[PDB]
Subunit: 320 residues, 4 copies
Amino acid sequence: SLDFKDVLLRPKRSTLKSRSEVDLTRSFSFRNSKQTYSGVPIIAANMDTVGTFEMAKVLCKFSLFTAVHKHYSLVQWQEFAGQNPDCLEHLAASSGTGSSDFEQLEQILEAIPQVKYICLDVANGYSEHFVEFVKDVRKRFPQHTIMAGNVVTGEMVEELILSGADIIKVGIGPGSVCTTRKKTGVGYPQLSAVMECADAAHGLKGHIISDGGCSCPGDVAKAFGAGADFVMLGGMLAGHSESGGELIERDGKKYKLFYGMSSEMAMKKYASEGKTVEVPFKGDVEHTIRDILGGIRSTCTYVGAAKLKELSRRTTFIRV
Amino acid sequence: SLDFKDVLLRPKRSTLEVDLTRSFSFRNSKQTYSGVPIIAANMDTVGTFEMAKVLCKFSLFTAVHKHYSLVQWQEFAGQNPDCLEHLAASSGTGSSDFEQLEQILEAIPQVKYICLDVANGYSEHFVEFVKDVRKRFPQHTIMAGNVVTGEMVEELILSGADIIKVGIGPGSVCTTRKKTGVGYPQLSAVMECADAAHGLKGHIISDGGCSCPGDVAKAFGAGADFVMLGGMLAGHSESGGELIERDGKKYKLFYGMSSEMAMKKYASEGKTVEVPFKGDVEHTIRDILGGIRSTCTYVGAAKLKELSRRTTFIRVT
Amino acid sequence: SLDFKDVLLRPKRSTLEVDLTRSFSFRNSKQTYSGVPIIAANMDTVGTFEMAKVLCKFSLFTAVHKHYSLVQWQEFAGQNPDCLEHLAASSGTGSSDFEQLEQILEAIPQVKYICLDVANGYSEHFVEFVKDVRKRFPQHTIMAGNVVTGEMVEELILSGADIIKVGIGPGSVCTTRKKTGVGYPQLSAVMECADAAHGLKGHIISDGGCSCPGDVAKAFGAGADFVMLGGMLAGHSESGGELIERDGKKYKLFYGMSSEMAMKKYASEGKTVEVPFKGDVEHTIRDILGGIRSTCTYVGAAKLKELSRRTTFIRV
Amino acid sequence: SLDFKDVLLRPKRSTLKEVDLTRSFSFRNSKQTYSGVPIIAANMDTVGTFEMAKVLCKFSLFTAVHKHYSLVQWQEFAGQNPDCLEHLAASSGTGSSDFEQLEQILEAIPQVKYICLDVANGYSEHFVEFVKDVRKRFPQHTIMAGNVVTGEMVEELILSGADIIKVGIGPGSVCTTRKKTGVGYPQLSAVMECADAAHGLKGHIISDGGCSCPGDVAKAFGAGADFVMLGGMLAGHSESGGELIERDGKKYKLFYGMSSEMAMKKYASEGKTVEVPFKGDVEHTIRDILGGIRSTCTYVGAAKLKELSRRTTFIRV
Ligand SMILES: O=c1[nH]cnc2c1ncn2[C@@H]1O[C@H](COP(=O)(O)O)[C@@H](O)[C@H]1O
Ligand SMILES: O=c1[nH]cnc2c1ncn2[C@@H]1O[C@H](COP(=O)(O)O)[C@@H](O)[C@H]1O
Ligand SMILES: O=c1[nH]cnc2c1ncn2[C@@H]1O[C@H](COP(=O)(O)O)[C@@H](O)[C@H]1O
Ligand SMILES: O=c1[nH]cnc2c1ncn2[C@@H]1O[C@H](COP(=O)(O)O)[C@@H](O)[C@H]1O
């Protein structure tokens, strides 16, 4: 039963030249969509304060991915797509299982053919209703790569991949502004979740996202080390200029709101399993991305992985 | 050796409103119960008639504290005939306590539950008290505690108790563990005592140590039939404890029944805290029930009766 | 590797006021004891004459600190003849300490207990000192320490000590552990050493690390014959240490006997704290005994002698 | 997986009757001989100073001098302080510029007979080959090389020419390696493993980082470290570098990681900056560390530091 804080990665003998030699790009072929991916497999979360068009514009420059939140209008999308044609390939449109959610998703995907990824997102990915929903989206968009979640165990990973999802989002309760564990007692240690879900998905030639619980670049590296194909970040990317969330200047300091998508704040804006925080303002996100990628490059260097693809193979966890 | 904090519930494949009601048939009293098996503690700041009136609307249970007068009881009962079915009158082992109790149960036949409550449920003296109350009130359902191990749960049920209160030292204003070194991790206590009670077709209350709706779910998931709450229900309009406005903030006193504050009022194993004021308890009750419904949904339980069967605990650091 | 915080006592079925008195017969001095076997530590802020006067009224014991003149002792004895039966005169090693001790014992024959106390009870030098004291005072009961393991308990008892003082590094104002890395978890120390002592019909004092009555209970439950308290008795009226009123609050100094503060007063392995003022020690003694009585009640012990017998520890 | 906090040393019977903290070593590859008290001031720019070297020499301690002195500053120091040169190392990373600077120092100051080759990652084949090259170039100088945390790499570095292997990745007080990269190793375990590896080849190790009190230094020696290197414990003194800052009525000194942004700016981060309350003259700190370790030796029955690891039994806490 391992969380990120329970482990370190062992350094290992390497034959690398320097650490500039390290390639964080991955190449993936998705099981069901048959589509191909090339990029740095870190994803801005589809939270309304994180998965913003402003976030996507910066992250595109580092070949990072954005799961866009589900509170932009079609006109907002078409304006963005018009102005930022070269930002559309590492971008996903998001939906819950609502008929209204699905409608809106369908209009974006019709209006903006360059968007080739769908993020289907529920708190409880273990319901039959979500499984059937994944199957239907798969029937409606056979060439769109589907991310689906969330779950924390292998049986549910297999079933979602066999139902038509390409990439399974892994994490229940680990998120920085999540209160699922306190309100319900349900969840799963994230690193253990990733290890189990990674094996289960890879057995079927599918993929996973480690979604939530990362608070430093070291955690991101551990999740990749444990076999995650992608890592999704909320709190690390909140509080930047490009982030959503109200700017609040009080008592001589600057803060940004950050809140869970099932917080009372979110539910009012548009039973609670999320909370609100005020994050000290962080400035521009590009400095944060550079820190994250630098940290992972060094991890690779320490374990002798010349490419991120080699990281999980070269990873031996030490229990602390 | 587990506390609530040592575990998470594993989510499970479901095919599914969750029904949080339970139906019980009590081994010794032979009476039946239907309701939401969450109980307001018989603390003087929690088990109040004002608490009872709201909890009734949600079909929750109130163990009333032992510091109301007969006139006060008679008053409440005459104006609130429909709260009476999910109410227990409480007593310690005292002569005076038993007398107060008897007067209440005589004058208010609608009260069909008795909460017999001492800090140390392991004393022969307490065992003999339970027997005496079972003789006196053959048709009343008896809750009796507290204990933390199976052999004592067995002994108490065979002595006539229907429902055993489980917990020594986990409570939010309890100081037993610091004062005496005595106690038992609550989750382990519940698991063990639940197996013991259920072997005799009896029942248990997880009494103490819940500070969030997830804890309540873990107690139920571990096999508790009922969960008893003090701290989570303290601090509301309906709660007792003086309202204190200081430094532009509002607080409510909450204190252990063996605290120096309680003893003065009416050797210490309880403390006093000031709780920031919480407003109406109704909103807390919804938050709790909403939490537990979601637990049920996550593990594929259509009703609370299924939760323990569908619970697989995951050990967390 | 257990500390007090690592365990709880399991309650047990009972058929029961609890007697906190114990009777002991000492292996080497051949003397007998009846009393409540909680001891005030021989720290200059705790093992005071004022502390002894209160503790006597509850039949508790006082290991007097080693920084009173003989004239001070003579005056206390003259004025307080009934407070002398549960008192020890304390000493470190070396000529001057031995000489002081002798003078006190000679002047005040009612003092029948000797507390021999060094940081490291594992040295040959200490063993030989225990031997000398025993030979000089063959009817005095000897407390000697400190140690944490069974081989050393045995050697000290065979060298002539009656009661072995157990604990290295657990004290609230001790810094041995940070300074030297040396020590031993106190509860495991107690269990091990008690078995060693009791095999020779000797006795132990659990010395250090109790910060609440539950801790005292655990120490006895693990088989400690006596429990010695410093920090729990510091900060009272009867305690030494300067009363300091500052920022509208009252504090008392409390400090390790190897703190720079102590060394200066008369290589540090102790520290200084300021303890909020606690008032009269009487109320604290009652809270302590009240808590231990309730432990006995929870486990079915009618007498303190029955507590280790009826103790089952739960790892928490 | 052990850290210094996870253990205590068991006391033991002794017949001692002051403890000698001097050691003598004969180095595997350089064939040179050492005698002194084997505690080393780290080669951080705030710790490995000429002013530090001057005080530490009085106690027979060792200084790994930082990389940011000029050639004239070295030559001035050596001219004015001929008696300090026996117990210092000149330092270098693997960059062309570092190594050149070092060559110039060794050419100017023939009394400097120790070299400290110091990278964050001693596991690279690039570092291994650089060690071989420095050994070829300076066959009579004693070479300290690191950092690593496992035996295979200790052996390889020793076989490649290094005399003394610097052990520790991530434990340092102002290191952020573990947060930025997830990479590391518990320091006590690293020391035990690496000491065994080194000693089997007749080499030696330095436990580098993670000591915050004398007890930690004693534990590292007790685990088999030949030397212990200190950054944090020596920061914040008069003799230390770092700016003296008087603010809010108090005195502080900067202390920062050599891969911190502060250090990089000054001359992708894996170190941080702190302000350490000013400690005064380092001599009193040195007396406290030595007194602590002498006292550990006394408790375990070691007349001499050379006997400590042999008399050490760790108890897990
Ligand atoms: O209200 C919520 N409740 C529980 N989890 C949430 C909520 N909102 C967002 N999350 C999850 O937390 C993730 C971000 O985790 P973080 O990086 O630790 O902040 C998102 O990708 C979601 O999966
Ligand atoms: O004074 C006391 N000392 C120890 N436990 C107490 C005291 N008063 C009430 N309790 C217990 O604590 C429970 C409430 O626990 P809570 O929900 O954690 O606050 C009550 O139902 C009692 O079993
Ligand atoms: O300076 C010292 N260093 C280490 N231990 C000390 C020192 N002074 C007193 N002690 C011990 O601490 C014990 C009291 O511990 P306490 O009850 O935890 O405060 C005394 O009985 C001594 O054994
Ligand atoms: O920027 C840094 N990042 C990581 N480790 C560092 C850095 N700077 C110095 N160190 C290490 O930390 C050691 C000192 O550790 P300390 O004694 O715990 O302060 C040095 O000898 C280096 O090995």
